[PDB]
C-alpha cells in the first residue's frame, strides 16, 4: 500500500497554521514536488480516518467512472504554480478552501486525488 503512502505525502497535511503562499512554497519542497514544479496540488487537513472513510459509505459516494466523493467537507489548501518556468524556484499562490473532495480508492485506502475540482 505504497500508493496510500504516496497519497499522504502528496495530499495530506494534518495541521498547518498559515496556509499562505509561503506555506505552499515550503510544503511543495518538503514533499518532493518541485522538480519539476507541479502545476497544481492540493493538501487535505484534519485527521486521516475521515479521508480513509471516503472509501466506505461512512463518508463517501461513488462518483463518475471510478472515483469516490466525500460526504463531509475538509479544510484544504491548493497550491498553484505562478510564473513561466516548470523548474525551481517554484513560486506558488495559495488558496485555502473548505469543501468535499474526490479521490480514487484501492483496498479501502485513497490512492489518488482528483485535482480537477480545484482548478479555478
Author numbering: 3 to 122
The authors write:
Angiogenin (ANG), a 14-kDa basic protein is an angiogenic ribonuclease and member of the bovine pancreatic ribonuclease (RNase A) family (also known as RNase 5). Like RNase A, ANG cleaves preferentially on the 3′ side of pyrimidines and follows a transphosphorylation/hydrolysis mechanism. In addition, the crystal structure of human ANG has revealed that it has an RNase A fold and the catalytic triad (residues H13, K40 and H114) is conserved. The enzymatic activity of ANG is several orders of magnitude lower than that of RNase A towards conventional RNase substrates, but essential for its angiogenic effect.
ANG residues H13, K40 and H114 (part of the P1 sub-site) correspond to the catalytic triad. K40 is a key residue at the catalytic centre of ANG and adopts multiple conformation in the native structure. However the conservative substitution of Arg for K40 reduces the activity to ~6%, similar to the effect of the K41 to Arg mutation in RNase A43. In the crystal structure of the ALS variant K40R, the Arg side chain possesses a single conformation and several key interactions of K40 (with residues Q12, C39, N43 and T44, which are integral to the catalytic site) known to be important for the stabilization of the pentavalent transition state during RNA cleavage are lost. Instead, in the variant, the Arg side-chain makes direct interaction with Q112 by reorienting its side chain (more solvent exposed).
